[PDB]
Ligand binder design. Sequence first.
Ligand SMILES: CCCCCCCCCCCCCC(=O)OC[C@@H](O)COP(=O)(O)OCC[N+](C)(C)C
Ligand SMILES: CCCCCCCCCCCCCC(=O)OC[C@@H](O)COP(=O)(O)OCC[N+](C)(C)C
Ligand SMILES: CCCCCCCCCCCCCC(=O)OC[C@@H](O)COP(=O)(O)OCC[N+](C)(C)C
Ligand SMILES: CCCCCCCCCCCCCC(=O)O
Ligand SMILES: CCCCCCCCCCCCCC(=O)O
Ligand SMILES: CCCCCCCCCCCCCC(=O)O
Length: 579
Amino acid sequence: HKSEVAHRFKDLGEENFKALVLIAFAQYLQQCPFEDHVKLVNEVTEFAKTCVADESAENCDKSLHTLFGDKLCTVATLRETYGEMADCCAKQEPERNECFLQHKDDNPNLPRLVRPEVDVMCTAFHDNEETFLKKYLYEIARRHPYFYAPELLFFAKRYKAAFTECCQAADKAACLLPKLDELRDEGKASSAKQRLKCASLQKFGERAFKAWAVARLSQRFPKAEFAEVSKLVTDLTKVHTECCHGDLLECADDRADLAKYICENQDSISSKLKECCEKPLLEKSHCIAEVENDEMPADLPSLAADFVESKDVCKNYAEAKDVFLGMFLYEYARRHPDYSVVLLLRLAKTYETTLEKCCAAADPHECYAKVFDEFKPLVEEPQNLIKQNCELFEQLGEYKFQNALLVRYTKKVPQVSTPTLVEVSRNLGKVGSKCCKHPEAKRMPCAEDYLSVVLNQLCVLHEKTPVSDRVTKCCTESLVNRRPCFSALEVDETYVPKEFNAETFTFHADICTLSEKERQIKKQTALVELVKHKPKATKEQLKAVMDDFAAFVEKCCKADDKETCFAEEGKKLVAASEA
Ligand SMILES: CCCCCCCCCCCCCC(=O)OC[C@@H](O)COP(=O)(O)OCC[N+](C)(C)C
Ligand SMILES: CCCCCCCCCCCCCC(=O)OC[C@@H](O)COP(=O)(O)OCC[N+](C)(C)C
Ligand SMILES: CCCCCCCCCCCCCC(=O)OC[C@@H](O)COP(=O)(O)OCC[N+](C)(C)C
Ligand SMILES: CCCCCCCCCCCCCC(=O)O
Ligand SMILES: CCCCCCCCCCCCCC(=O)O
Ligand SMILES: CCCCCCCCCCCCCC(=O)O
């Protein structure tokens, strides 16, 4: 249409318009102060209206990329503050915006945002949330310059919802802290999931991304015929591509295009999309990616007919192989929402290998007549692994559970950072606590999601500075093999325990006045070093020693005097436990 500026304002809404404009500028001009942006966001919302009023107002017919670009190159401290970047202004069109895109900083050099106190948070809220919420939005925006504007928008309107319901409450913190934490982790398990969709696209290939796409998409839209899922896949993949590139506009659009094709052919695709395609343009796509598994036609056969028995199997393969291996995955995938995508993938890898050896051969029919056998062991592993993993967690709490994982993944790899062996140890915890709260039916997919991010923030931290091969081997490995590879570590015979240095195992009264989280971390931390010291430690020598540090805290951080309770009663463990 006529002037893209009005098209956007009218259909997005002055409100949303500002939010996204704020974000968009904040994602590029990471250095400039919040107050600056506010001035931009109005100077622009004020201009925009000029078209929402008579779209043929000077400059309205310009392209948003030209507009966006033109006003960047208007900032002033552009060079003084950005430099290199000021140099895109002398370039051009297509080239000017692309130039700008190459200069946004993955890892910004700002401080960690401290989370102030419920009280000031509240007080500042009731107060003008405009700038309570816009500033914090601005803050998150610049620290994560690649996060999808509209989505960051959606988080925010929940962070808004959050203060709404707690700030006006009895005991505030109690209400909100949980929520806030929950919204926090929610965002990392989204930031990282967004940064993983891409690497995997660049590392393993377009074929791989598609494979995954057909899998996940079928499980979700099981009554959609293959050619449909197939069409939805090619689109996704492209969508997932221009988005990884990072051109927030082209990205947004595609997602909208694909968003509304689906909307316009739901009968072919799904039912459960009724209540999402009634949403406004901005959410259409998000709502959908989050839609819920559609139901199966139940009456559905068995993959045996089409993939083992017939004849022509070998022929239908050769005749264009991915189509085939795709169909295979489709069918297998749609009949098993309860499997995590990568598991259907080895099923595919497995099957693939099998032909490939089989159609090359004396008698294929009898050569592969029996793969489904090769599948059972694959499917059963993660099922046993989740079963007894959620069972162990049923006994011990999140806390006592981590501590299990803590010892376990230290003996298997005591080279790694202690703080790291602690971070991940817990993150795992939460995953247990999360996804064990589901039923078998939805257990595995849910783990793959999280486990897949956690079990990576762990790699990069290890890519930061290497410490093990095994950990580095399981990290170079394929997204498909990455998991088992970990679930297949054994405990480091080679090593020699760490070197007694006590200043460690010594706990001054500090631990009385600390918080729930911190107390546990100081405990878990020593929990590790201790294992790092006496690696061959038993599930019973430990349990004792641990029951000892207990009632030692109970102790010291209790009866009248503290402060040397710990100290005298302290050393009465240090050497004290050693047996
Ligand atoms: C409708 C607009 C309302 C205002 C929008 C901004 C509200 C957000 C308020 C944030 C206030 C708290 C800041 C803080 O201390 O948070 C710690 C954050 O770093 C946690 O960030 P998250 O929102 O969990 O992650 C969003 C960024 N991700 C998803 C790219 C990682
Ligand atoms: C030091 C790094 C630790 C790596 C973890 C080792 C690999 C296995 C970790 C066990 C998981 C413990 C957390 C938990 O309580 O959940 C149960 C998990 O075992 C379930 O995960 P999986 O069934 O492997 O997830 C399915 C992912 N698959 C299907 C692609 C393997
Ligand atoms: C060389 C040997 C020195 C021994 C001390 C050095 C490291 C100590 C090793 C234990 C590390 C802590 C283990 C852990 O992760 O949690 C332990 C806690 O659950 C202890 O229970 P608490 O509730 O703190 O104690 C309560 C006391 N009660 C149970 C008697 C009431
Ligand atoms: C299997 C879910 C298919 C949903 C297709 C909706 C496509 C909208 C854009 C896709 C981006 C969302 C990423 C995701 O679904 O994980
Ligand atoms: C001057 C800049 C105006 C910029 C407005 C950016 C608009 C983004 C609209 C995004 C529509 C997204 C649809 C989707 O994500 O599914
Ligand atoms: C159109 C997609 C065809 C899917 C082919 C099924 C074979 C299993 C794929 C497993 C992931 C492959 C990883 C890789 O290619 O290195």
